[PDB]
Amino acid sequence: IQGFLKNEKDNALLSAIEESRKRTFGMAEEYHRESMLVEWEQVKQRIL
Amino acid sequence: LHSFHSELPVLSDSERDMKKELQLIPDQLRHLGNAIKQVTMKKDYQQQK
Amino acid sequence: PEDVFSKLQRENIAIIESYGAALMEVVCRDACDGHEIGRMLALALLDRIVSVDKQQQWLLYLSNSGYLKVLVDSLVEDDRTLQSLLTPQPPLLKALYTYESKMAFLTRVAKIQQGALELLRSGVIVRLAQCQVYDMRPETDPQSMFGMRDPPMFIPTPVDRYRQILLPALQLCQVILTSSMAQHLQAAGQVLQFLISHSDTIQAILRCQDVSAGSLQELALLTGIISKAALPGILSELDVDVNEGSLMELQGHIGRFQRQCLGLLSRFGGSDRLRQFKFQDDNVEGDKVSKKDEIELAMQQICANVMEYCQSLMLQSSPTFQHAVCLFTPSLSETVNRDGPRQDTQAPVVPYWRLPGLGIIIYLLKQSANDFFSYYDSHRQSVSKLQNVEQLPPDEIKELCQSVMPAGVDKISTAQKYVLARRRLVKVINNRAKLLSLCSFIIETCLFILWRHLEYYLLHCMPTDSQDSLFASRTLFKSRRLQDSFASETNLDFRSGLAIVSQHDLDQLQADAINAFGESLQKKLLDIEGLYSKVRSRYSFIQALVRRIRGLLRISRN
Amino acid sequence: GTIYLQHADEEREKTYKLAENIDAQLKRMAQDLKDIIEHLNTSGAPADTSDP
Amino acid sequence: VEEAREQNERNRDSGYLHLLYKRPLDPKSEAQLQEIRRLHQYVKFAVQD
Amino acid sequence: ADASPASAGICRIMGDLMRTMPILSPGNTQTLTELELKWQHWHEECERYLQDSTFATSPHLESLLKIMLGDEAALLEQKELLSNWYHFLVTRLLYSNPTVKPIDLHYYA
């Protein structure tokens, strides 16, 4: 029991770290794209 | 090839960063040459023994 | 109405607010100074507070207390450990995990414009430009492709540990250049200095012949970093003692990044993207589908970021249309020479010192105006599957499950499998929507860059056969020595790197553009504006460019 | 014939003379090591081919 | 002879001199430094062995 | 320059070279390699005025240019203006090595 109730607790700490990191890193591409698209959404007004 | 390189008017960054490294090695060579002396005096001692 | 997830985060952040500076010390100090796992969890905890704080109370604590700089100057002591984790057998991955959470917290702070400015005020880009681990790139052996078939070990490769180090650092630069809007030229100056502190490593990314999801992700960050910091106006707006030599090296690096990024439009915006996929769609079956959504995505990300950079150059280079920078030569041949099948004589790799033809932009315009119709009905099917998950075949529910968990799928519950299926179908829907938004931009920007080259070459380009020019040159390149005194503009004239344009190249560009922009393409572009641009404020923008190109393509020189 | 010595050339020769002295001292330390090793391996070799 | 011939023509370009600040080591000065590093490491290991 | 309208023009070339010298400023976000590459231009500009013979009308200003170029002979011609060897050391570091490190310093001392 003390092996099993360690291994899944160390797995659980790592999973709470994992989604924090990866959901902020994928939001970095999504934040680049939406700022990239919104500055293009200025440039097209200036053009037209 | 050594006279076609002596006529450059200023030191490069890499000629200064080589000098910074070349100025370090004399103090490691002291400790390394002392380690040769230490091992030779160890050999001299074992051989005399 | 407010959803319960909008409510519960307000009341939880009002509880966390209520403990004040004592709770802020207890977490921020432990993020700087605590145990291996203490710093790690406290940095993911700060990432999570800063994802519900709307007042910026935690940012203003983190800055004024000093902790936001301690969590930046420590990167130069993290480097020393991360270099060890690139060895074939790393001693403990713990330090990579604390770095990935430190870097996630920075990549959270940097999405608030004031937080990104406070990171340029600590100097985070200059500390990243002090970490040697980004130049510790492992050598990827091409002979290894006969070396066994090995299991998914609990320790990643050195090449992918290098990705877990590099990709967070690239994403922070990219995020700072997208929260720091077009005012703060110092942000772009710092990120340009980081790309030059790693200069031939950055070019070795731009020269990587790998087509993995990883090499395309390395390129899809790097091109999207290059698009906003390799810009001309930054070189007029960096007023400091800089020596004439270091400034000409800075131009010598920008004039390396520009030309090597243009070399990706011929690789992937060009005719041999249709070669690259066959080396993936042929050999290795068990992982093809899961990774092809990412490789198709990252390819169009790299296309969009270089079209963003070309667009930026065609907006900064002059306000006056007569002094617009051309980046694409009058050759449209790159659209013509394929309608007849012959054997694979090695195509001679285009020297990345050469400017691409304008035919690559018409080829890219044509191809995203095909890819968009694949992606549109793919998204519309993936949404239909997300609307009907419990009706899917039990073997397709298993393909979706194995696309997330490559083991253990025959050991999980029916609800667990339906939840995996919903969560893969959302990843596919969002990757495919992300792809439509990329094809949308690349179509509109292909039409912008095409309009601007066509407006220049017809109306403002003089063919070099004009013999009156025989009086314009012969008097500067003869030796004098010494004396004296200052006061003119040293301008290095990049117009000496342009192509010799004949009137035949202008006649050819006209004859070819008239056919290569034929109304079969013009209809499809208006059919796409009929489907997609109803979602955006500027319906008729594609029509306005297609109209101005149709106007130019009807002018005759007389 | 016609050049004045610049301070950079004097510093460059002073850097390359430092490298020459260290190359010549390292090759000597290495020959001293090789002579010590040669002696360590010859002392192991008993001279009498009359031994069966 | 061709290495020396090309080197001799480059030394006359008034545009070359301003770039020299950022020049790497020449491929003999870097090679003598690579040999000094190799010899130092050998002399360090052989003293231990 | 106020008293001597014959030297004043040359005294102001010397004086403006005494304003272009790249000295480090504690409030200023530069690298050592920026200070170094600036100071190398300033040295290549000071020596240029010596080749031009610009100061060979007042030997005091010709000495000040050699001192400002790190000339170890002209600095020792100033020994009756250097009351101790450690001021001579710091002068020699200011005009011959502005990127000196603790781990170089023994040799200069």
From Swiss-Prot, chain B:
Protein's name in the database: Nuclear pore complex protein Nup88
Species of provenance: Homo sapiens (Human)
Record: disease: Fetal akinesia deformation sequence 4: A clinically and genetically heterogeneous group of disorders with congenital malformations related to impaired fetal movement. Clinical features include fetal akinesia, intrauterine growth retardation, polyhydramnios, arthrogryposis, pulmonary hypoplasia, craniofacial abnormalities, and cryptorchidism. FADS4 inheritance is autosomal recessive.
Subcellular location(s) per record: Nucleus, Nuclear pore complex
The organism's place on the tree of life at top rank: Eukaryota
Included range, full protein: 644 to 692 of 741
Gene name for this UniProt entry: NUP88
Organ and tissue specificity: Ubiquitous.
Complex formation: Interacts with NUP214/CAN. Interacts with NUP62 and NUP98.
Function comment: Component of nuclear pore complex.
UniProtKB/Swiss-Prot annotation, chain C:
Subcellular location: Nucleus membrane; Nucleus, Nuclear pore complex
Residues recorded as bearing Phosphoserine in the entry: 485, 488
Tissue: Expressed in the testis.
Family from the record: Belongs to the NUP186/NUP192/NUP205 family.
UniProt subunit comment: Part of the nuclear pore complex (NPC). Forms a complex with NUP35, NUP93, NUP155 and lamin B. Does not interact with TPR. Interacts with TMEM209 and MYC.
Function noted in UniProt: Plays a role in the nuclear pore complex (NPC) assembly and/or maintenance. May anchor NUP62 and other nucleoporins, but not NUP153 and TPR, to the NPC. In association with TMEM209, may be involved in nuclear transport of various nuclear proteins in addition to MYC.
Known disease link: Nephrotic syndrome 13: A form of nephrotic syndrome, a renal disease clinically characterized by severe proteinuria, resulting in complications such as hypoalbuminemia, hyperlipidemia and edema. Kidney biopsies show non-specific histologic changes such as focal segmental glomerulosclerosis and diffuse mesangial proliferation. Some affected individuals have an inherited steroid-resistant form and progress to end-stage renal failure.
Protein name as annotated: Nuclear pore complex protein Nup205
Species in which this protein is naturally found: Homo sapiens (Human)
UniProtKB/Swiss-Prot annotation, chain D:
Subcellular locations according to the entry: Nucleus, Nuclear pore complex; Cytoplasm, Cytoskeleton, Spindle pole; Nucleus envelope; Cytoplasm, Cytoskeleton, Microtubule organizing center, Centrosome
Glycosylated sites: 50
Post-translational modifications reported in the UniProt record: O-glycosylated. Contains about 10 N-acetylglucosamine side chain sites predicted for the entire protein, among which only one in the C-terminal. The inner channel of the NPC has a different redox environment from the cytoplasm and allows the formation of interchain disulfide bonds between some nucleoporins, the significant increase of these linkages upon oxidative stress reduces the permeability of the NPC.
Function comment: Essential component of the nuclear pore complex. The N-terminal is probably involved in nucleocytoplasmic transport. The C-terminal is involved in protein-protein interaction probably via coiled-coil formation, promotes its association with centrosomes and may function in anchorage of p62 to the pore complex. Plays a role in mitotic cell cycle progression by regulating centrosome segregation, centriole maturation and spindle orientation. It might be involved in protein recruitment to the centrosome after nuclear breakdown.
Family: Belongs to the nucleoporin NSP1/NUP62 family.
Domain notes: Contains FG repeats.
Protein name as it appears in the record: Nuclear pore glycoprotein p62
UniProt lineage: Eukaryota, Metazoa, Chordata, Craniata, Vertebrata
Gene: NUP62
Swiss-Prot record, chain E:
PTM characteristics: Probably glycosylated as it reacts with wheat germ agglutinin (WGA).
Tissue specificity field: Expressed in thymus, spleen, bone marrow, kidney, brain and testis, but hardly in all other tissues or in whole embryos during development.
Protein location: Nucleus, Nuclear pore complex
Top-rank taxon, per record: Eukaryota
Site entry (Breakpoint), positions: 34-35
Role of this protein: Part of the nuclear pore complex. Has a critical role in nucleocytoplasmic transport. May serve as a docking site in the receptor-mediated import of substrates across the nuclear pore complex. (Microbial infection) Required for capsid disassembly of the human adenovirus 5 (HadV-5) leading to release of the viral genome to the nucleus (in vitro).
Assembly and interaction partners: Homodimer. Part of the nuclear pore complex (NPC). Interacts with NUP88. Interacts with ZFP36; this interaction increases upon lipopolysaccharide (LPS) stimulation. Interacts with DDX19. Interacts with XPO1. Interacts with XPO5. (Microbial infection) Interacts with human herpes virus 1 (HHV-1) protein UL25; this interaction might be essential to the capsid docking onto the host nuclear pore.
Protein name (record): Nuclear pore complex protein Nup214
Source organism of this protein record: Homo sapiens
Gene from which the chain derives: NUP214
Region of the whole protein represented: 779 to 827 of 2090
